Symmetry: D2
Subunit: 293 residues, 4 copies
């Protein structure tokens, strides 16, 4: 079962921008400890697009060694290139991941038929692991229609859709057309509303530092406690407001650093460092979250 | 009391000659009242105000007031590109006894934010006491405001509410967080349930004319913590919206109301065209379903 | 000329302190444009602040401009409104006043199907009673984004004799010319006039022609004689002015310059348009001086 | 002449074999083909070279081979841009080692970087270019990065920047850039508006279609220089008939196909996800190759 609340994993680096293996392992265990349902590895949040294929494979392998069998593992193997995506898909299979995922190839304009074959090819290389289609127009620049999304999710081998879109009319339409589809809400800031619209879970960057809040929203809605669901979402959004100001990945890494999970809170260039004017708020947030749970 | 609630965006019935059908207008107002609607938003996009003259818009305002003043809440959309024209309608809404005025951000010409603010100020002055409902609808106006700009508009002297026709529910939550007492109407019918959850405390929509009770049912369900009921109702509303978008929203609604014996002639004004005859069976069946449901 | 090709100024509508039409200034502006050697005037469009004017006010301007310039220069009446019926009323008036053609922006605000847009133009053409129609494509303001195929269909509708192309896409400008060798095609963005002509436009309609139309005529002439350098220098000078007008506000900046040229009595635009920022007056006054000396 | 970057330069394609691997023989043939039609230089490793579906070592291999074939004969610009600053720096150092005349980098994409981050990205690559002028690359349609004129002005005035490849159809901005930077090397990016772009202020251009008809673009430059507007328009019109076709067929694969018929490229395939050319377009593509060879 792929339904659930899963954190989009960050990739810790050292002062020289190389992978910090010890912090990667610590972050994986940290997520498992807070009760996350699984991890989405090698996606936007893992800074995969500023990593080489071998670096992405190194991360996939380490995460699997640390969490395989404990929580669900989804490997985002998407690249612009189909061949590169296939290589990562085959490696994900070798490492024992539960599923693979791929963002719609970007930069170059591709036809819908080309997108479809891209997914089919990756699915073939995944050799048995279900595919999680990844729709994120804001970053990819690829704007799919409802009909096209329906076609992609019905392709043989596709078992889920990560929907990073704020269009909750479309979210409802997708659920209506696919009653059994695993549908992950992609924008943390509308999680509650996304679930109400039809999503049955979610994948997000902020889950790394407060995943229990999202689990709390799932529970609140299940119990019909709208008040609690809204309060939790509101608190999540106060945090998201901050992270958007500071820079999301580096802000999260900085909080995790103050929690003693991540040794060095740096992202790879061109991402810059966190503006020191935000440290007081980030330190206070880490303290608050550590006390909270 | 207050302006919170579920308000239908009133349609303007026309006769075979594109002229106001007074009889059908009155029937539609009473029809909405009987559905349990909290009020009516008159003279906005749904009323085809932008293809009507000022005199025609005033006529609709006056008649609706005669039919519902004192029974339900009445909000008059007096917005025009012109500030002076908007002011004229504002003065008329006051004269007819409306509860509030509203104005879409002036469109077509690119205006600076300062000009948008002064526009609202001038209309509020002419509204002579009636609270202003700011109207954010980027998809149609082409005006894209930032959260900071929206906060400034809703805090202008005389503003008492915001009609938020935006599918951005992160911003909906941000607005609620910044203005806990603000009257906030969800503008897109298709995400009503999610909009309320995010922070809206009511809504204004075109489809309320034929199934307002369903939206009232969503408010009740969420209030009683009945998530499934709220979702099921929203799903049903969206099945209707799917159809209406295919047929054309205003004319599709008028056609359903026609089969409900409310609107004599379901036509919209040109350039709007007629409903494709192939959709009549579905619209008639829908009208039948709704009537049996209500 | 026995055709509609040429350089036509998009006429501004002078108002008094009460924001009411200033007839004396309107007449002066019309004569001023004729004196500049303009080929014609495009009346009642964006630049005339038509969308903050009533139907009767738009008609009043049409009548006056006709009284002043009919038979002297070409006159195109922009009768476009969101409403088809309202557009038809203005079309009938334009015919009665003796305008040479009518024009209409793609109806906006509400989303209309392409078929509805086509019927809209057909209806107005019917009311124009013989006057040719100038289709008006201006996506930036109207929000209507037509494809090349749709534009081709619109320009070939019975009764259509021209297209005002307010688009910065010069690939599409060339494609339109390639598909319609005889079509009258007006470049709409003053700031790319020279390049627009090179791409295929055979004339233009613009707001800034009101204060320096002779520069645009100079560009047409320069290109006709193969004097690229002169064409570029003129376009550059036009853009220096356009840079300023965009900062000050185009319509009010233009009106202010005209005020200093003793053409417009009160350089005000109608609300929500605000007044010019006094900090710009020095530059605007200097520009007026320069333009007058240039003549 | 020795250091001048102004001119008409083809955005080089990367020929592959049936297995999607680099076809060195065809790459060499394509370089010579461009030199023979009088091109002023080559822009290598950009969008057109399918760089974003190539690995760093593959991009370096192409850079090295092109240098061996054309260094000293025509100008060579190495597009070393990657989303990652470190990868870009690696390519920049290699470009200098191979003897390129300049480097270039597209604004990093996918992730929403701040303007300050874009600036530091360019500064870092410029440092690694150790002497080679930088050609800023503005192409919003593909990168999704929309810069303001003020931001473009800041970028082109960074120490070490000697040019800007402007892939934008906004000719008002093209003129504004020329007015603000009278000595800046400004390349028109959209082939379909080349003539108008030069008139607006560009002093040269870089484009994909130059690979099959570069002499036409040189013809437009000469025409405008001589004041022959009719000839300039005629050439642009013929170029646009071709561009209309390539947009329908797929630009890179359509070009490779024409080059295959001109006996330059062995196998005209692009790398997946790019699909093959729809066979219904082969008649026009073959006829185009015949026409161009006749013309040349």
């Amino acid at each position: 079962n792929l339904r659930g609340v899963m954190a989009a994993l960050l990739t810790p680096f050292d002062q020289q921008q190389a992978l910090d293996k010890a912090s990667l392992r610590r972050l994986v265990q940290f997520n498992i400890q807070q009760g996350i349902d699984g991890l989405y590895v090698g996606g936007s949040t893992g800074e995969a697009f500023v990593q080489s294929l071998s670096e992405r494979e190194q991360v996939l392998e380490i995460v699997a060694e640390e969490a395989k069998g404990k929580i669900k593992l989804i490997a985002h193997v998407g690249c612009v290139s189909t061949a590169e995506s296939q290589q990562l898909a085959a490696s994900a299979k070798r490492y024992g991941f539960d599923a693979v995922s791929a963002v719609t190839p970007f930069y170059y304009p591709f036809s819908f038929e080309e997108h479809c074959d891209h997914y089919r090819a990756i699915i073939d290389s995944a050799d048995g692991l279900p595919m999680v289609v990844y729709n994120i127009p804001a970053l990819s620049g690829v704007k799919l229609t409802l009909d096209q999304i329906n076609t992609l999710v019905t392709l043989p081998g596709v078992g889920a859709l990560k929907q990073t879109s704020g269009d909750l009319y479309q979210m409802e339409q997708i659920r209506r057309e696919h009653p059994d589809l695993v549908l992950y809400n992609g924008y943390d800031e509308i999680f509650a509303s996304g679930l109400l619209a039809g999503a049955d879970g979610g994948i997000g960057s902020t889950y790394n530092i407060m995943g229990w809040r999202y689990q709390g929203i799932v529970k609140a809605l299940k119990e019909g406690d709208i008040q609690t669901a809204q309060k939790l979402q509101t608190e999540c959004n106060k945090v998201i407001d901050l992270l958007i100001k500071t820079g999301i990945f580096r802000g999260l890494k900085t909080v995790l650093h103050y929690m003693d999970v991540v040794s060095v809170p740096l992202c790879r260039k061109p991402f810059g460092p966190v503006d020191e004017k935000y440290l007081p708020e980030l330190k206070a947030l880490a303290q608050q979250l550590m006390q909270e749970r």
